[PDB]
Design a protein around this nucleic acid. Structure first.
Ligand code: ZN
Ligand code: ZN
Ligand code: ZN
Length: 502
DNA sequence: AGTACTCAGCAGT
DNA sequence: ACTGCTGAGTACT
């Protein structure tokens, strides 16, 4: 069950990983011969790659009721994700159905705003049938199945998609699994083609985790009476980070806010080698870029700014690089570009959330504090509580896997660990940014990535949090603990040891 | 093994 | 905004 949840999560992570890989390969090609712009569907190719390696879930079956591992509020960008998970099989069509006896009943529906659906209440939904749009709608296939579901009283999965404008700022939050509904009644009515249209009333089954749009709603409206401060950054951030509490009159804890890292006095100034590019640094350009070569001959970012894959170290263009700030190799240096707020949690003290959907691979924020040789946990105040041991270790198994999917080739297994000579740690107990409020979780939606701009000392990189899920709005932001690299978390979330190195 | 169907997702305008 | 186009997967002839 938990085991199921992790299979789903990792399946979606794999899928999007492949998507961004295909995308990076295309961005590496010159403007003129890029497949993007000329009818490229990364969703289809990613899909096909996963299906080839037997990575689909619930393949060859229809699920009625709850798909194991799929929870209310889960977000998708592509209709295709629903297919690989078995949530909804058709790539396009709104209605999915299956045999339930000799009759056919609806497994799942998609309300994307194609027809004039009414989703006005949290509780109840009016769903337009499907028929050519000029003939009257026929009561067959999907429409029939949704009708039969009424007598059979068999639940229906409801995914609502946000209205898709080709304005298309993003695909973040494109589909939300809203959950399980019963079909109550259906009628015929004239629909705006001048021909008759079917309509189905669905009622959400009680006792389900409540709808997310209802939570952006409860949250949204200005009054925000939970506000403790408008801007915890106190103007040091291009946008205010507000603090809210609806569980108390607790003010957030006191600290000096900082956006820049405090190095010690002894930590040598080490300027880094820079690139000479006139334009934005890409693999596409005829002229080679020193910072690209530094990243192993690949842009570790997509053009929208998403990290392509985790890496031991990511090199961004420095202050003495000659490229415009719009350079794709500038992402984490530009600072926070999401609406963040800190909030009181019943259980966990103080936490960080985002009030909009965060697409997978997105940059969140830096863990800013003052940097200390690990030797000095001598301080005594920030014990654990506002402390971040800078990650030294790495394992190439995941890259080995992504590699196997995309090329059929792996590098040999290798693992890295920082010498105990220098571990470094970031203390935010006294000074830090919003990153200091991020809590820890056994199932995180954030992971820490080391980036180097400013300097080349690889023992004191910047810690940049990225997103490893499509994160629903208001979902709490959390990252996991460092780990020993001999130990890994299995399906049930228990610590085991990695299989033989070989 | 072939065809009809589509609540996507692009791309040109 | 309004078009037009190529579609994956699945259900049926
Ligand atoms: Zn650059
Ligand atoms: Zn360059
Ligand atoms: Zn550079």
């Amino acid at each position: 069950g938990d085991s199921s949840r992790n299979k789903v999560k990792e399946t979606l992570r794999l899928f999007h990983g492949v998507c961004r890989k295909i995308l990076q390969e295309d961005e590496a090609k010159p403007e003129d011969q890029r497949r993007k712009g000329k009818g490229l569907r990364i969703d289809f190719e990613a899909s096909t790659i996963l299906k080839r390696n037997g990575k689909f879930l619930n393949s060859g079956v229809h699920i009625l009721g709850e798909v194991p591992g799929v929870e209310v509020g889960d977000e998708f960008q592509y209709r295709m994700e629903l297919n690989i998970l078995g949530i909804h099989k058709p790539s396009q069509a709104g209605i999915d159905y299956m045999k339930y006896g000799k009759a056919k009943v609806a497994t799942s529906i998609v309300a994307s705003g194609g027809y004039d659906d009414h989703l006005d209440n949290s509780d109840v939904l009016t769903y337009t049938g499907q028929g050519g749009n000029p003939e009257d709608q026929k009561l067959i296939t999907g429409n029939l199945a949704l009708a039969t579901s009424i007598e059979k009283q068999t639940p229906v999965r409801v995914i609502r998609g946000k209205h898709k404008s080709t304005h298309d700022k993003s695909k973040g939050g494109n589909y939300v699994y809203d959950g399980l509904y019963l079909v109550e009644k259906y009628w015929q009515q004239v629909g705006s083609h001048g021909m008759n249209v079917f309509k189905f009333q669905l009622r959400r089954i009680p006792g389900q985790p409540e709808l997310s749009w209802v939570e952006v709603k409860k949250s949204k409206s200005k009054y925000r009476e939970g506000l403790c401060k408008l801007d915890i950054s106190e103007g040091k951030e291009q946008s205010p980070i507000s603090a809210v509490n609806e569980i108390d009159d607790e003010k957030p804890p006191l600290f000096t806010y900082t956006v820049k890292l405090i190095y010690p006095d002894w930590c040598r100034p080490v300027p880094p080698k820079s690139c000479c590019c006139t334009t934005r640094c890409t693999e596409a350009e005829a002229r080679v870029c020193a910072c690209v070569e530094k990243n192993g001959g690949e842009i570790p970012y997509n053009f929208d700014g998403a990290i392509v894959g985790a890496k031991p170290t990511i090199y961004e263009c420095g202050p003495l690089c000659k490229c415009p700030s719009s350079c794709y190799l500038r992402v984490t240096q530009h600072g926070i570009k999401l609406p963040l707020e800190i909030f009181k949690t019943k259980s966990r003290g103080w936490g960080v959330r985002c009030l909009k959907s965060i697409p997978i691979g997105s940059f969140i924020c830096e863990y800013v504090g003052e940097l200390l040789e690990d030797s000095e946990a001598e301080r005594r105040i920030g014990n654990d509580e506002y402390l971040f041991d800078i990650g030294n270790r790495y394992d190439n198994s995941l890259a080995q896997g992504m590699s196997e999917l995309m090329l059929g080739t792996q590098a040999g297994r290798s693992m890295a660990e920082g010498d105990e000579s220098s571990g470094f740690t970031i203390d935010a107990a006294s000074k830090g940014n919003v990153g200091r409020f991020i809590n820890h979780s056994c199932s995180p939606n954030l992971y820490a990535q080391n980036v180097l701009y400013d300097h080349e000392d690889s023992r004191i990189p910047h810690v940049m949090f990225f997103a490893q899920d499509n994160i629903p709005p208001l979902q709490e932001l959390c990252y996991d603990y460092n780990y020993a690299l001999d130990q890994v978390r299995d399906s049930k979330g228990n610590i085991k040891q990695k299989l033989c190195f070989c």
